[PDB]
Structures are given as structure tokens and as C-alpha cells.
Structure 1
Amino acid sequence: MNAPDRFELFLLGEGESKLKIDPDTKAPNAVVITFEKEDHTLGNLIRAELLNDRKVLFAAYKVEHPFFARFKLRIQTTEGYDPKDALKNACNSIINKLGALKTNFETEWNLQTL
């Protein structure tokens, strides 16, 4: 009855954006990014890869409450290095790795029987 529509777990509602980036004021050179209509799948990952760019002084994520498909990512970077960029690379890195994992699984599969 008070049940929200299922498709709200992945469809941005009229006038929302995947990302919203606001600058954390508590610390220097750090930012908080809200991912709308997304969940752990994509967060825990971007938090991880992001935890390699040693130019990254901090990175964590969190799902405010289960009822709502969305989470916040906080990123802190070295001086001169902008996080919006840190995220950029941290992503490609994810892409690139997966791309390889794609070909490689196909390789192995073709060389199969049954």
C-alpha cells in the first residue's frame, strides 16, 4: 500500500542526477559525492580502487538507509591533486581491468568443450 515502485531502485526521478558533488568543509581538499539510484554494487568498488591512488588520503562510502537506493562517497586527496579526477581514473582503472577479464574469460571459454 505504502510500497514504493520497484523501478525506483534504478530510474532517476524527474530532475535528479547520478552525481551531486559537494565540498566537505570539515577538512581540506576533500569532497562528498552522492550517487542517486545505485547501491553497494557500484560503491564498495569505487571505494576500493579509489583506495589505491596513493594520492588519495581518504575514501569511504555509505548507504544512508536501505529504503533508499543511493549512497555517499567521501574522497580526500593530496594537495594540487583534485579528487574529481582521482575518481575519474579510479573508474577507468575499473573499466580497463574488467575489459581484460572479459576477453580472458572468452578466451578460456572458446577453448572449451561440452
Structure 2
Amino acid sequence: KTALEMVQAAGTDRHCVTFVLHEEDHTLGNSLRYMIMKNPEVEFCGYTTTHPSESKINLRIQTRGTLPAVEPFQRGLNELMNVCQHVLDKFEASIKDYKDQKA
């Protein structure tokens, strides 16, 4: 009930998809936008806020060829997760070596 898909029209075209994400804000929207914009198969990626009163965002993905636009979504999510894991490991290592060299 958090993330829901919506096709571009009644024709159910997989090229242009809109993901409505609940209880989110500009943080995850912008992060996923940056992580999926680097995908060469994405023609248009864009996130927007419906209204500041309600906590929901609408991302829109339009691919180049016949991509279902759901595979780039999962790709961007996995890439962002890997980036977060890498930065967490690097920050932990940096803090640990700083504590070691300080004493």
C-alpha cells in the first residue's frame, strides 16, 4: 500500500510508469532520481510532490525502448542500497582508524 504503480493511460503501456510512494519526502525521491538517472535506458526520470499537506511523492519513469520501467526502478533501488552499504563500511572503517591513530 506504500508504493503503487500507474500506467500512462488505459492502454497499459509499460514504457511510461508512475510510482506513487507514501510517507516519503524529497530525500528518497532525490536519491532514487540520481541513482536511476544514470541508467542509459531511461529517457525521462522525474519526482514531484502532490501537496505539502500529505506525505506522498510521485515518480515518473519513461524508458527508451521496450523496457517495462519497473526493472530500472529495482535497478536504481539496488544500486542505492549498495552505495549506502559501501559508504557505511567506509565511514565505519574511517572512524575506527581515526580512533586507533588518536590513542
TM-score by length of 1: 0.79
Which residue number corresponds to residue 21 of structure 1?
Answer: 5
Is contact 2:24-2:55 (8 Å) kept?
yes
- Taking only aligned residues, the RMSD between alpha carbons, in angstroms, comes to 1.6
Higher relative contact order (CA 8 A, sep 6+): 2
Q: Which has the higher helix share?
A: 2
User: What is the aligned counterpart of 2:67 among 81, 87, 91?
Assistant: 81
Q: Which has the higher strand share?
A: 2
User: What is the aligned counterpart of 2:85 among 99, 104, 108?
Assistant: 99
Which residue number corresponds to residue 70 of structure 1?
Answer: 56
CA shift, 1:24, in A, is 1.1
Stretches of structure 1 that go unaligned for 5 or more consecutive residues are 1-16
Give distance in 2, aligned partners of 1:111 and 1:79: 48
In structure 2, the CA distance between the partners of 1:28 and 1:98, relative to structure 1 (3 Å rule), is closer
| Structure 2 residue identity aligned to 1:19 | A
* Moved segments of 4+, more than 4 Å: none
| Structure 1 residue identity aligned to 2:21 | F
* 2:8 match: secondary structure: coil
Give distance in 2, aligned partners of 1:103 and 1:83: 31
Stretches of structure 2 that go unaligned for 5 or more consecutive residues are none
Number of residue pairs matched by the alignment:
97
TM-score by length of 2: 0.87
